[PDB]
CSV table of N, CA, C and O in Angstrom, one decimal:
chain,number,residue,atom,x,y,z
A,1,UNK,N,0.8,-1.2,0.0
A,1,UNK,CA,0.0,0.0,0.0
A,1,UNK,C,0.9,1.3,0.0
A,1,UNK,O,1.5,1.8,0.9
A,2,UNK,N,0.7,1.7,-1.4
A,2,UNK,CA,1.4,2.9,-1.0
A,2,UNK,C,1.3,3.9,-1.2
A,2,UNK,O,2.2,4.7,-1.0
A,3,UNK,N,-0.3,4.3,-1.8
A,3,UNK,CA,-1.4,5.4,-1.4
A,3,UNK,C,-0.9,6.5,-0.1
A,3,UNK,O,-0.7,7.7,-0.2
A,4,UNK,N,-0.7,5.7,1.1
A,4,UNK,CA,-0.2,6.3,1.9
A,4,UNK,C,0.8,7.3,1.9
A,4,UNK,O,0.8,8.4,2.5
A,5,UNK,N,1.9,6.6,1.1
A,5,UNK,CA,3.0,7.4,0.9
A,5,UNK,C,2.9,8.7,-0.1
A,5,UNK,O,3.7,9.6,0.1
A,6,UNK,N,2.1,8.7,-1.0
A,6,UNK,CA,1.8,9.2,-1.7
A,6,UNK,C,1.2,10.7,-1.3
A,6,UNK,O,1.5,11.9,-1.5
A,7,UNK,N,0.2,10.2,-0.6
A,7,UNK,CA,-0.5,11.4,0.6
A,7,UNK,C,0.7,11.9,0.9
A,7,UNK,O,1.2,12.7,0.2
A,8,UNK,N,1.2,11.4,2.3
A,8,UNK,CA,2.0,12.2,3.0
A,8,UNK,C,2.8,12.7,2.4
A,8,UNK,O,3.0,13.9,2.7
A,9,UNK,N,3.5,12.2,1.4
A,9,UNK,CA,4.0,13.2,0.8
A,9,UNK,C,3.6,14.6,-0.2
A,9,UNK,O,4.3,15.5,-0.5
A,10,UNK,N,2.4,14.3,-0.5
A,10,UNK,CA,1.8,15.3,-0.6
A,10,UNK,C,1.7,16.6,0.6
A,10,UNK,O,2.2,17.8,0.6
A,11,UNK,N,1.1,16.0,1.5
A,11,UNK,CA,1.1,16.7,2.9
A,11,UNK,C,2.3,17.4,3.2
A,11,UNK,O,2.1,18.4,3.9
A,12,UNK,N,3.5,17.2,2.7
A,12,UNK,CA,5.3,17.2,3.1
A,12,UNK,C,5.1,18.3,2.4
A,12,UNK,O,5.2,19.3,3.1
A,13,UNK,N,5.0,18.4,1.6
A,13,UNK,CA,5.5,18.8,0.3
A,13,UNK,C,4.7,20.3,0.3
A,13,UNK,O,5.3,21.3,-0.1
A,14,UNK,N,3.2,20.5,0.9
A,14,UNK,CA,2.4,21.3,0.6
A,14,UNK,C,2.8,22.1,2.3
A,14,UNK,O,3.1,23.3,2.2
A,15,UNK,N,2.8,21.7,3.3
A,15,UNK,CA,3.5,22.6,4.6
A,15,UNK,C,4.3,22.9,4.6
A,15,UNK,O,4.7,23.7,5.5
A,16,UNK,N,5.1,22.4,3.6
A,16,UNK,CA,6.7,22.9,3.4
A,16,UNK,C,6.6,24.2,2.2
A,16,UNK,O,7.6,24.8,1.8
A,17,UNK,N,5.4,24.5,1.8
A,17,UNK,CA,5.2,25.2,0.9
A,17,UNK,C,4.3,26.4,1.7
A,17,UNK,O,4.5,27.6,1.5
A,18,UNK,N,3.5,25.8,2.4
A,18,UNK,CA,2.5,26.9,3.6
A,18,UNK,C,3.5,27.6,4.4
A,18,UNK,O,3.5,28.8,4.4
A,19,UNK,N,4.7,26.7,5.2
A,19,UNK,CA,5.8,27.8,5.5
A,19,UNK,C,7.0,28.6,5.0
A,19,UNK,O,7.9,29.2,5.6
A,20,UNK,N,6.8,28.5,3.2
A,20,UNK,CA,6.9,29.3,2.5
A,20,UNK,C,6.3,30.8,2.0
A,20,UNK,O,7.0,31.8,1.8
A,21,UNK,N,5.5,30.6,2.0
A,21,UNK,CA,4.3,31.4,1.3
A,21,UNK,C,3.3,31.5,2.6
A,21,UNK,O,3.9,31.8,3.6
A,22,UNK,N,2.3,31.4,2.5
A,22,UNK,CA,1.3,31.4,3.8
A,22,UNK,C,1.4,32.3,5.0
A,22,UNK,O,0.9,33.4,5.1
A,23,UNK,N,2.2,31.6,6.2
A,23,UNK,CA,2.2,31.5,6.9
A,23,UNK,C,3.1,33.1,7.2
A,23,UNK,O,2.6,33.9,8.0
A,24,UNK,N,4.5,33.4,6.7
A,24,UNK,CA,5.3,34.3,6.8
A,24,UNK,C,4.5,35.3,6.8
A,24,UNK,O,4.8,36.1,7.7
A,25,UNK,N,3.5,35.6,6.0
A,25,UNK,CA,2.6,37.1,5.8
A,25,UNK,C,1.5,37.0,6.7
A,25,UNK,O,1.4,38.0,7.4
A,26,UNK,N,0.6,36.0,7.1
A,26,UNK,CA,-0.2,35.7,7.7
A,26,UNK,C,0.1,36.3,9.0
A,26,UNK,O,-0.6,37.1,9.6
A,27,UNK,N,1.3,35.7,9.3
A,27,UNK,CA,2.1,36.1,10.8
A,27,UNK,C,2.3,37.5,10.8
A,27,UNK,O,2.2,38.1,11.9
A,28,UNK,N,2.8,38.1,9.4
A,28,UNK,CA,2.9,39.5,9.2
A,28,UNK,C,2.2,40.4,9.6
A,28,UNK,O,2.5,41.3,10.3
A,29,UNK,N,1.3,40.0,9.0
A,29,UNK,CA,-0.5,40.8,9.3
A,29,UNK,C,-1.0,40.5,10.5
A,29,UNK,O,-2.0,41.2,10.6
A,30,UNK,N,-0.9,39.9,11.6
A,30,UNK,CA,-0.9,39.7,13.1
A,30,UNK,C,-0.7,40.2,13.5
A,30,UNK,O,-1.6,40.8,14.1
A,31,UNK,N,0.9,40.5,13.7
A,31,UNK,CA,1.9,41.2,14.5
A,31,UNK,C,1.6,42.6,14.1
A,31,UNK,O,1.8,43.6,14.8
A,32,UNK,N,1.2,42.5,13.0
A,32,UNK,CA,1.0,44.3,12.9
A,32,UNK,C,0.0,45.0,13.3
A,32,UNK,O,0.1,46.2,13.4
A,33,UNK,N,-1.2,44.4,13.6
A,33,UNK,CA,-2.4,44.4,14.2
A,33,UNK,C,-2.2,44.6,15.7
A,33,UNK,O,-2.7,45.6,16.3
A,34,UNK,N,-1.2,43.4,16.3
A,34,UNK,CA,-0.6,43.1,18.0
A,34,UNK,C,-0.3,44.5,17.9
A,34,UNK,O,-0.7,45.2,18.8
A,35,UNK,N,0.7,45.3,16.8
A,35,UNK,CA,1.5,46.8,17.1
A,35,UNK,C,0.8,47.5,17.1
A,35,UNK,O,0.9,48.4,17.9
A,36,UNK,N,0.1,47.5,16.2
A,36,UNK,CA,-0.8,48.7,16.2
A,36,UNK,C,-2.0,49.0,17.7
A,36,UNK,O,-2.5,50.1,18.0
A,37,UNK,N,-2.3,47.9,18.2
A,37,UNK,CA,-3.2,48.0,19.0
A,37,UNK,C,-2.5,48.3,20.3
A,37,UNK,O,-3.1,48.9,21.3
A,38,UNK,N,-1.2,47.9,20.3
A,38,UNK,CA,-0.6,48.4,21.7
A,38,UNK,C,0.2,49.6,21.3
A,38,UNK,O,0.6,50.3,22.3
A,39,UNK,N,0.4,50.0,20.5
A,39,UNK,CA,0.8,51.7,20.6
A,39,UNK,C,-0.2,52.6,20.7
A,39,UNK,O,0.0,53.8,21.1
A,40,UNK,N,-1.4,52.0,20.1
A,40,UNK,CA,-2.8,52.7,20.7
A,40,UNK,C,-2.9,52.6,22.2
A,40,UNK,O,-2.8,53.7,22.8
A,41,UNK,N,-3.1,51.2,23.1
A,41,UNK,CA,-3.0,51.3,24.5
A,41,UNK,C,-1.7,52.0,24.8
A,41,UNK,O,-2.1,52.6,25.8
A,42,UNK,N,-0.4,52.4,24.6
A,42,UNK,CA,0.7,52.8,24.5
A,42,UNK,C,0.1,54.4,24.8
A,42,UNK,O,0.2,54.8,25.9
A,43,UNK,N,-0.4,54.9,24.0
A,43,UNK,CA,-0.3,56.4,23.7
A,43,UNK,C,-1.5,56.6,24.4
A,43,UNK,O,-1.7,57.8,24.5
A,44,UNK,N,-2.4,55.8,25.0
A,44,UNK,CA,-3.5,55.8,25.8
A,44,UNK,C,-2.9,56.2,27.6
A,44,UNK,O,-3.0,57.1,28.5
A,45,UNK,N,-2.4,55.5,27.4
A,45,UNK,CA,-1.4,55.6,28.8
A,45,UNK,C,-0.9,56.7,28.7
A,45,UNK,O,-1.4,57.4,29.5
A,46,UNK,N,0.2,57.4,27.8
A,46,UNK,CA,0.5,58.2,28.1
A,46,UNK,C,0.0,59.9,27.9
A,46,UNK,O,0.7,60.9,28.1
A,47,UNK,N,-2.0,59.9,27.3
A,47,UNK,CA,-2.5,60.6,27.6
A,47,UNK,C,-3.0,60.6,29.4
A,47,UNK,O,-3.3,61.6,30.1
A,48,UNK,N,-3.1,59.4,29.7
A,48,UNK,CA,-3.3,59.3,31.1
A,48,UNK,C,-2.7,60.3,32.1
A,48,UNK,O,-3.1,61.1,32.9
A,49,UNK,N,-1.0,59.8,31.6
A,49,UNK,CA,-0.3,60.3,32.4
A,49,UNK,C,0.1,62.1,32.8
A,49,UNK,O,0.4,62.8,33.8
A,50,UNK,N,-0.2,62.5,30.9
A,50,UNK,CA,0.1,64.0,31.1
A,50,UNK,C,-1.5,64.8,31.3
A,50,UNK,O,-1.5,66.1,31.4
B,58,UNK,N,-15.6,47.0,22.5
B,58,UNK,CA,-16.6,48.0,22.6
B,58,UNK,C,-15.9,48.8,23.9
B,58,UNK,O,-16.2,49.9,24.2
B,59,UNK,N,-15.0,48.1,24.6
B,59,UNK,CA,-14.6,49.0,25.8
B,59,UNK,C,-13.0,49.2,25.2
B,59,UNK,O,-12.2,49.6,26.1
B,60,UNK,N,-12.4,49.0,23.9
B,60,UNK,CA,-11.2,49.1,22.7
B,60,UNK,C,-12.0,50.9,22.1
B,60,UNK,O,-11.3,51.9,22.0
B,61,UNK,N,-13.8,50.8,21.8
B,61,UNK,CA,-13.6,52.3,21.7
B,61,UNK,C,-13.7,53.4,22.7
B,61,UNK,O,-13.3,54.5,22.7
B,62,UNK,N,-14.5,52.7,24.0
B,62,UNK,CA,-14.3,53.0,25.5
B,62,UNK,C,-12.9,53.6,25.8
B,62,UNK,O,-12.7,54.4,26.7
B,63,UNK,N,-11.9,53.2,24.9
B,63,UNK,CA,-9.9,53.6,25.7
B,63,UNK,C,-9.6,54.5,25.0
B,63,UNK,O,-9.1,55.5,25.4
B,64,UNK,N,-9.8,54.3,23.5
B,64,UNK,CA,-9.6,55.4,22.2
B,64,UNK,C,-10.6,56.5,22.8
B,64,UNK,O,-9.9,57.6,23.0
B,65,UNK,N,-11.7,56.6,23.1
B,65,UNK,CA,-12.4,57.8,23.3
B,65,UNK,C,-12.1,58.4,24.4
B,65,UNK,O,-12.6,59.5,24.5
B,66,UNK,N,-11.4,57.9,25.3
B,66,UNK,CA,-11.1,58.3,27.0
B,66,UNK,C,-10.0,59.0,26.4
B,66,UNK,O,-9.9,60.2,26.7
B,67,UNK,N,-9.0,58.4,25.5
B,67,UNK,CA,-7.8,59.3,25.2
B,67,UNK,C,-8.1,60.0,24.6
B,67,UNK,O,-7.4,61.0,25.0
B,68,UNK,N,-8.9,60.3,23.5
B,68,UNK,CA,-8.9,61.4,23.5
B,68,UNK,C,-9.7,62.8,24.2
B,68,UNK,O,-9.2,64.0,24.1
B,69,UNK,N,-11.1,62.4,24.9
B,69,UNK,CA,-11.3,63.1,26.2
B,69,UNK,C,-10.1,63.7,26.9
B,69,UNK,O,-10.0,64.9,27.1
B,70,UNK,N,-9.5,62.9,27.1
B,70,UNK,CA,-8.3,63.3,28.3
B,70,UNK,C,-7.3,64.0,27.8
B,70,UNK,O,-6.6,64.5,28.7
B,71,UNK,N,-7.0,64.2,26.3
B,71,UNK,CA,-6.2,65.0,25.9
B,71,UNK,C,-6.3,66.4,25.5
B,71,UNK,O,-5.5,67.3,25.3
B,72,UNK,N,-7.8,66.1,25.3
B,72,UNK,CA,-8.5,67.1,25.1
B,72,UNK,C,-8.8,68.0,26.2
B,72,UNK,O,-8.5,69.2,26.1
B,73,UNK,N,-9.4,67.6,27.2
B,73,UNK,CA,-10.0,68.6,28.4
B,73,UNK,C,-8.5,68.1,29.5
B,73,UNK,O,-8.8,67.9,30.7
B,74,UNK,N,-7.3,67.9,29.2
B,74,UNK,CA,-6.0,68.1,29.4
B,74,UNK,C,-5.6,69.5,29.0
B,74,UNK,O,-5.0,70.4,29.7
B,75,UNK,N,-5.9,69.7,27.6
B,75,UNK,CA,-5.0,70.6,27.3
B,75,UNK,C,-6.2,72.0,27.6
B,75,UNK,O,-5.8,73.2,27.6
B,76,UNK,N,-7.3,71.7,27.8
B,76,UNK,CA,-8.3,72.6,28.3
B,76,UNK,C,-7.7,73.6,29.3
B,76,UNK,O,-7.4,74.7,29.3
B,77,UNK,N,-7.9,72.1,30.4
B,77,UNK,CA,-7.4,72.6,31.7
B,77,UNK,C,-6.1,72.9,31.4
B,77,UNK,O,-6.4,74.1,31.4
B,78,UNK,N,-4.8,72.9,31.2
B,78,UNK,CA,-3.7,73.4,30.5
B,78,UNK,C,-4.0,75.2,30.8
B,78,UNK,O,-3.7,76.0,31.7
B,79,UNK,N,-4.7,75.3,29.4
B,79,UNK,CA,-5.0,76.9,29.0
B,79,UNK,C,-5.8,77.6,30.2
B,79,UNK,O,-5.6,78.7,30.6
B,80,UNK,N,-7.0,76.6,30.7
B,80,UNK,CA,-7.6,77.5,31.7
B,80,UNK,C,-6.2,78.0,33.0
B,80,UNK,O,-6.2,79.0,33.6
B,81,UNK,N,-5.2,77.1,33.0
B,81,UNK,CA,-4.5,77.2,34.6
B,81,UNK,C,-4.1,79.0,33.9
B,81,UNK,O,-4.9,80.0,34.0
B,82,UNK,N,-3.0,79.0,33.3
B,82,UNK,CA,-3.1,80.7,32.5
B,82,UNK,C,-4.3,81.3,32.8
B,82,UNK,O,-4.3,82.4,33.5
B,83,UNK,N,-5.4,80.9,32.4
B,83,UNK,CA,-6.3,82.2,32.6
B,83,UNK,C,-6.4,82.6,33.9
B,83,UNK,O,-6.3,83.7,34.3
B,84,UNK,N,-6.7,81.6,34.6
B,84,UNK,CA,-6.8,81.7,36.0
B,84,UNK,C,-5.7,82.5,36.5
B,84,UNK,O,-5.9,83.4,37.3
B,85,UNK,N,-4.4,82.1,35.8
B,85,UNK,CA,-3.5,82.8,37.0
B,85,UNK,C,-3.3,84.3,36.0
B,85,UNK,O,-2.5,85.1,36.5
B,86,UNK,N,-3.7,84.6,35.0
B,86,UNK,CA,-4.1,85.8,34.5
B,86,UNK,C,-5.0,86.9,35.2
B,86,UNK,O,-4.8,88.2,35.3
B,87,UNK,N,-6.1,86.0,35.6
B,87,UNK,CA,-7.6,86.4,36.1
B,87,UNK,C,-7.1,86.9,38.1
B,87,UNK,O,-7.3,88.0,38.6
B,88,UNK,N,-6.7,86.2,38.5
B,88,UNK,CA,-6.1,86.2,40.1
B,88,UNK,C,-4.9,87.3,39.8
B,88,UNK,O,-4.6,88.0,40.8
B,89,UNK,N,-4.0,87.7,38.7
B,89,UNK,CA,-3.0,88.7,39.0
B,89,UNK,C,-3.8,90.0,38.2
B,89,UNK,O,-3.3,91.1,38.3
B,90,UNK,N,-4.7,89.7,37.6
B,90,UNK,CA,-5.0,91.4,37.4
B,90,UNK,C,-6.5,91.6,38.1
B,90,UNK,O,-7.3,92.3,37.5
B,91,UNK,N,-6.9,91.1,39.3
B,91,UNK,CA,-7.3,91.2,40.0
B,91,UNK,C,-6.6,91.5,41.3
B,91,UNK,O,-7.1,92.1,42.2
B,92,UNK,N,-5.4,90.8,41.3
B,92,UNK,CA,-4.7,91.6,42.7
B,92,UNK,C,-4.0,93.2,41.9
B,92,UNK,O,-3.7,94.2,42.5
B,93,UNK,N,-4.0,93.1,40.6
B,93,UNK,CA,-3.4,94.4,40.1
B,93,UNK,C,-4.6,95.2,40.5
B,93,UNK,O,-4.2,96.0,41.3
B,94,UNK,N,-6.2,95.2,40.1
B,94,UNK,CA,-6.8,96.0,40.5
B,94,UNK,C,-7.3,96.4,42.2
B,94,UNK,O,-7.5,97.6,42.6
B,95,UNK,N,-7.4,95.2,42.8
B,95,UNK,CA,-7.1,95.4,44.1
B,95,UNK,C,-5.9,96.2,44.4
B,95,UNK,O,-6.2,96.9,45.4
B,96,UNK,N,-4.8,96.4,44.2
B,96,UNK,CA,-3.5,97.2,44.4
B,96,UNK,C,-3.5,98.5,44.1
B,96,UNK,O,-3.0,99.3,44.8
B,97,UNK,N,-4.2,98.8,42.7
B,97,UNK,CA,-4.7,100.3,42.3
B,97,UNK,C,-5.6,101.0,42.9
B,97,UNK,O,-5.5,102.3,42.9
B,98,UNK,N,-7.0,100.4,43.6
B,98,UNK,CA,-7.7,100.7,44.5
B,98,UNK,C,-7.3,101.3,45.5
B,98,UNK,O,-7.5,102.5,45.9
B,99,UNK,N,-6.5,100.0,46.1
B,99,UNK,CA,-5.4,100.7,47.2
B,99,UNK,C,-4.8,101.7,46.7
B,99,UNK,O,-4.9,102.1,45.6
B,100,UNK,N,-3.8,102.4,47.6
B,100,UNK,CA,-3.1,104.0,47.3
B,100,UNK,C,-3.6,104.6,46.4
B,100,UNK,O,-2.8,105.4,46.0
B,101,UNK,N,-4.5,104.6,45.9
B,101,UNK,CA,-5.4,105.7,45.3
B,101,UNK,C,-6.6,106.1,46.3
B,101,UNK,O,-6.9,107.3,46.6
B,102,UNK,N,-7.2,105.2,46.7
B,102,UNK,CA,-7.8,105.7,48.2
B,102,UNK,C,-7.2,106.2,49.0
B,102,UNK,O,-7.8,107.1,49.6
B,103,UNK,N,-5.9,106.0,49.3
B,103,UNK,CA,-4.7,106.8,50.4
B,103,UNK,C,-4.6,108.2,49.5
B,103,UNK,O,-4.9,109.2,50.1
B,104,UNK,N,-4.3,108.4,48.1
B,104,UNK,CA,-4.0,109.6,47.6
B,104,UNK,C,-5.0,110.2,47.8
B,104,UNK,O,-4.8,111.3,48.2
B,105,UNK,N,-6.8,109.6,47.8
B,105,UNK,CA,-7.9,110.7,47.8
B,105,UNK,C,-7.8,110.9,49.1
B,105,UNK,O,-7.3,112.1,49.2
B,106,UNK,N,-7.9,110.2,50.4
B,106,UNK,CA,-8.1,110.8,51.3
B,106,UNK,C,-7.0,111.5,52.3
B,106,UNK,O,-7.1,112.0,53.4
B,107,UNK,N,-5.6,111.4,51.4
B,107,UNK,CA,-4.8,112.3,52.0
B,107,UNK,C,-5.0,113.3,51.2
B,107,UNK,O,-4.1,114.2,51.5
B,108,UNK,N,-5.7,113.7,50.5
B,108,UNK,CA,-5.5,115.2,50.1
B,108,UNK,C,-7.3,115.7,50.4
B,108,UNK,O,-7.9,116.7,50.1
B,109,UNK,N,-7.5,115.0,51.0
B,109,UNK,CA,-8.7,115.2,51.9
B,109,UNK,C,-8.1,115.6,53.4
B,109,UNK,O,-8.6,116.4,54.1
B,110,UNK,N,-7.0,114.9,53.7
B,110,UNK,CA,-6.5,115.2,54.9
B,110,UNK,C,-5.7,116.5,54.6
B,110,UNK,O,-5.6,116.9,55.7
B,111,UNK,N,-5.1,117.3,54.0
B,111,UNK,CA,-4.2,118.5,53.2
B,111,UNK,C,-5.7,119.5,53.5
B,111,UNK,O,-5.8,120.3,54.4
B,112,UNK,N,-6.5,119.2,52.8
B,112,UNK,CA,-7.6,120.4,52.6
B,112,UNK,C,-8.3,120.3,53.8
B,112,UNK,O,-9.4,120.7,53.3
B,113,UNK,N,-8.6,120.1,55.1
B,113,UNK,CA,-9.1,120.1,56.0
B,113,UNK,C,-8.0,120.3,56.8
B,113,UNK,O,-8.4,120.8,57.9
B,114,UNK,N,-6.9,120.2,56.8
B,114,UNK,CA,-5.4,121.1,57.7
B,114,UNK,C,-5.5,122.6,57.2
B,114,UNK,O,-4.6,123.4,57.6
């Protein structure tokens, strides 16, 4: 049987291609969201303070 | 909804920050030419009634 192998390596082949492509921008667009929303709390604070 | 609750507080607070800011100036504008007029008041009532005290000598 070696359908199986076939799969998985499909599978290999295609995550190894999602942490090519995919995943690097995906993560990009997160993190810039995470930044953006704490330099907002960031600058929130520091209307607090003055 | 408490994300526009923080955005809106900052800017509230920056806003009637810099309010109060400008009012402290006025105030301390408002308190020194009010002791200026209180002070002109003064000795000028000493000048009227010392020359009330001159014309009655």
């Amino acid at each position: 049987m070696s359908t199986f192998i076939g799969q998985l390596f499909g599978f290999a082949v295609i995550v190894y291609l999602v942490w090519r492509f995919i995943v690097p921008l995906v993560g990009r667009l997160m993190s810039a969201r995470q930044d953006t929303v704490r330099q907002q709390l960031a600058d929130a604070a520091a209307a607090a303070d003055r | 909804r408490e994300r526009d609750a923080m955005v809106a507080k900052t800017l509230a607070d920056n806003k009637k920050s810099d309010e109060q800011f400008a009012a402290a100036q006025a105030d301390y504008d408002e308190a020194m030419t009010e002791a200026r007029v209180q002070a002109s008041s003064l000795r000028d009532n000493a000048r009227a009634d010392g020359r009330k005290v001159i014309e009655d000598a």
